[PDB]
Design a protein around this ligand. Structure first.
Ligand SMILES: Nc1ncnc2c1ncn2[C@@H]1O[C@H](COP(=O)(O)OP(=O)(O)NP(=O)(O)O)[C@@H](O)[C@H]1O
Ligand SMILES: [Mg+2]
Length: 444
């Protein structure tokens, strides 16, 4: 058991991690910005350290301040949660070099999977199915680039190797646009890294992703999949597990290839392989080398506490859970709750004047918010996650509708009414909508 850890994050995930720590008897240190003194998890933590002012560069991305916090409190480990420094290989390195356990993968693994070109090469070698592509960086010889395009078959997509957040990529539908599309992506994505690659452009994929756990001692398991196709500006809005239409046989096929890839790259901890799924086929696009926001839907359908497993792995324990003990049962849906004007979709901070959480069988509310809590203007819009589990998908969705109606968040604007609309959407109710659906539905 880890004696004491620094929770190097904020909001709902910081509270998520604190709960897992409390369950396991692990002492907690909440590092926070000066704008986050009233966070629920900070108020519940055993120790707290204000690591700097509101701007993340001097708080949640402040590597020296976070490491000093660990030093002053005599912590043994640091959990980076998601976002912020979780996939910063320099942070991981410095954490370990400074004498602390980094609750995540090795820095080399973060680098390997953090660069898209190197990540694709490793997956291709490991036998994970990848999107047909250039399999390496593009030069500026445009006879050669037109040849790669022909081999792949248009339409293709130009992607920045250091790209992220839906930025640094251009869809190319023919030769005439190829030259300019490569040159501009090479500029627009100069993220500082000019390196671009070419992928086949999949025109109606679903987002299907595979959860893994690996102990970094040779054992790896997969915990089924999630469908996260309901997106806006490439940002996920609803997630569910398992993915509609995925058979046990298909699940086992892609699951086993991901688990094997973990062994090949010496992966350690929780991670997620993200695929575009189209015409019954999986195509690798990215590995998130950290816990994911939507991890709860997988927890609901497998019974596995993913955060507690992260902590056990970090403590140096081998996986106790064998693959044959992992069973998909029932179905779960997650609705992200955002402090945003639904129409303009940009953050809406302010004091919550009335709050009521939903309850009931299968209802799980993941949020730091409370009545009188002020949502600050500085950080991400997501203030909570509503997760509903049922014996089947219909029951999960029915419970989500019921839970969303009970959820009261007054004083700020939220996307609750939108989540109600998505739950009531006939195509969502059928299932299997693609990554373009929500924007088409809304008019975006
Ligand atoms: N080969 C492809 N075909 C179709 N769409 C793609 C392809 N590659 C990326 N995309 C789009 O880009 C989205 C995800 O990008 P996002 O995570 O916002 O930033 P990114 O990490 O730079 N790109 P990615 O590598 O796809 O995760 C996908 O959900 C697709 O909509
Ligand atoms: Mg990445």
């Amino acid at each position: 058991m880890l004696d004491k850890i620094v929770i190097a994050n904020r909001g709902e995930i910081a509270l998520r991690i604190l709960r897992a720590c409390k369950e396991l008897g692990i002492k907690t240190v909440a590092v926070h910005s000066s704008a986050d003194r009233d966070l629920k998890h900070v108020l519940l933590a055993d120790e707290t350290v204000c690591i700097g002012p509101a701007p993340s560069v001097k708080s949640y991305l402040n590597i020296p301040a976070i490491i000093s916090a660990a030093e002053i409190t005599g912590a043994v480990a640091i959990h980076p949660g998601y976002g912020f420094l979780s996939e910063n290989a320099n942070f991981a390195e410095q954490v370990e070099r400074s004498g602390f356990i980094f609750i995540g993968p090795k820095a080399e693994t973060i680098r390997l999977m953090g660069d898209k070109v190197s990540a694709i090469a490793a997956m291709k070698k490991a036998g994970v199915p990848c999107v047909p592509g250039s399999d390496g960086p593009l030069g500026d010889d445009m006879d050669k680039n037109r040849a790669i395009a022909k081999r792949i078959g248009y339409p293709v997509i130009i992607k920045a190797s250091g790209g992220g957040g839906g930025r640094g990529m251009r869809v190319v539908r023919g030769d005439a646009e190829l030259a300019q599309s490569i040159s501009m992506t090479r500029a627009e994505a100069k993220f500082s890294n000019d390196m671009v690659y070419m992928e086949k452009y999949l025109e109606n994929p679903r987002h299907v992703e595979i959860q893994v756990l690996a102990d970094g001692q040779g054992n790896a398991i997969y915990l089924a999949e999630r469908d996260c196709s309901m997106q806006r500006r490439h940002q996920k809005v609803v997630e569910e597990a398992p993915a509609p239409g995925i058979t046990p046989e298909l699940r086992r096929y892609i699951g086993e290839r991901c688990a094997k890839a973990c062994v090949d790259i010496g992966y350690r901890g929780a991670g997620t392989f993200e695929f575009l799924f189209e015409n019954g086929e999986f195509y690798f696009i990215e590995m998130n080398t950290r816990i994911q926001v939507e991890h709860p839907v997988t927890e609901m359908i497998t019974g596995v506490d993913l955060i507690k497993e992260q902590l056990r792995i970090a403590a140096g324990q081998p996986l106790s859970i064998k693959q044959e003990e992992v069973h998909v049962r029932g179905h779960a849906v997650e609705c992200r709750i955002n402090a945003e004007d639904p129409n303009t979709f940009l953050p809406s901070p302010g004091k919550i004047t009335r709050f009521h959480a939903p309850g009931g069988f299968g209802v799980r509310w993941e949020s730091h918010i409370y009545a009188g809590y002020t949502v600050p203007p500085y950080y991400d819009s997501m203030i909570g996650k509503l997760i509903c589990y049922g014996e089947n998908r219909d029951v999960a969705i029915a419970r989500m509708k019921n839970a969303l109606q009970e959820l009261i968040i007054d004083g700020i604007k939220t996307n609750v009414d939108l989540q109600i609309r998505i739950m009531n959407d006939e195509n969502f109710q059928h299932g299997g909508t693609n990554i373009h659906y929500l924007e088409k539905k809304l008019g975006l």
